[PDB]
């Protein structure tokens, strides 16, 4: 023998959707963080008045 082979190889990235399209769902989850609180804001002060 007298054999030394030490080797390397390269990676295959699984198609993780591979587009920005993920953002739109992320935009919906923005808005549900965003547009919800003022309901309570005006709710508690509607209840004050």
């Amino acid at each position: 023998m007298a054999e030394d082979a030490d080797m390397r190889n390269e990676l295959e990235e699984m198609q993780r959707r591979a587009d920005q399209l993920a953002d739109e769902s992320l935009e919906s989850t923005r808005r549900m963080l965003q547009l919800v609180e003022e309901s309570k804001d005006a709710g508690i002060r509607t209840l004050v008045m």
Partner: protein, 237 residues
């Protein structure tokens, strides 16, 4: 905080700033104040070594010290008058058990203010191409920018290689015709004398088989000093 007052010259206790009163500023201790100009008037990286853990090498320690730590410890102004760039790149070649990694340990961690990044042999090498090599520039990438955006003056960065002969050998004779260890070394060389001409590092290697090591790396400026350490004489002993 007033430090010294001089008259127009006697040094006085209370005086009167007038139009033609020149004033100098100096950043305090443990200060992060970057003052520039020369309306100023200090950093010395070595505060204490009395003696550290060593005997017999009072010649060799003297040589290494004067060569690669004197440019550091000097008036900066005169050295830029001198126009010389600091030597970097210590090498140590000898037989085993002669106290080399001890020596390397003490200077980096006991002599001067930094934490050195140390590779224990290779930690570098990896199954994937390019990221092992990239770890090299992951080493240098905390000190390079630092010089870029502080210029000449900087806190010293250090790299200690150890048993470097394993990772580096003469090209063309490496594990067959092309070689596995060839591209790591072509990066290392590319950075140390690299096109950026960073001045703020010393590379400390150590070996027991220095002939293997490539002259290409050993010529001055990449590693300038190849220093033998050997079996001590009795008085050192």
């Amino acid at each position: 905080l007033v430090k010294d007052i001089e008259a127009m010259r006697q040094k006085i206790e209370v005086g009167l700033v007038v139009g033609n009163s020149q004033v100098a500023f100096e950043k305090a201790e443990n200060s992060s104040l970057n003052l520039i100009g020369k309306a100023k008037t200090i950093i010395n990286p070595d505060w204490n070594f009395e003696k550290m853990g060593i005997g017999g090498l009072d010649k060799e320690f003297s040589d290494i010290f004067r060569r690669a730590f004197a440019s550091r410890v000097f008036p900066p102004e005169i050295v830029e008058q001198m126009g010389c760039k600091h030597v970097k790149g210590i090498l140590l070649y000898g037989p085993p058990g002669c106290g080399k990694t001890l020596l390397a340990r003490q200077i980096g961690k006991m002599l001067n203010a930094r934490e050195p990044k140390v590779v224990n042999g290779p930690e570098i090498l990896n199954k994937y191409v390019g990221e092992s090599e990239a770890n090299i520039r992951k080493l240098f990438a905390d000190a390079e920018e630092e010089q870029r955006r502080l210029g000449a003056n900087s806190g010293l960065h250090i790299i200690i290689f150890d048993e470097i002969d394993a990772i580096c050998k003469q090209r063309g004779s490496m594990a067959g015709s092309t070689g596995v260890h060839d591209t790591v070394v072509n990066q290392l060389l590319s950075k140390i004398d690299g096109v950026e001409q960073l001045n703020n590092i010393l590379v400390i290697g150590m070996t027991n088989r220095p002939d293997l090591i490539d002259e290409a790396l050993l010529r001055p400026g990449r590693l300038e000093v190849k220093m033998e350490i050997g079996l001590p004489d009795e008085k050192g002993r």
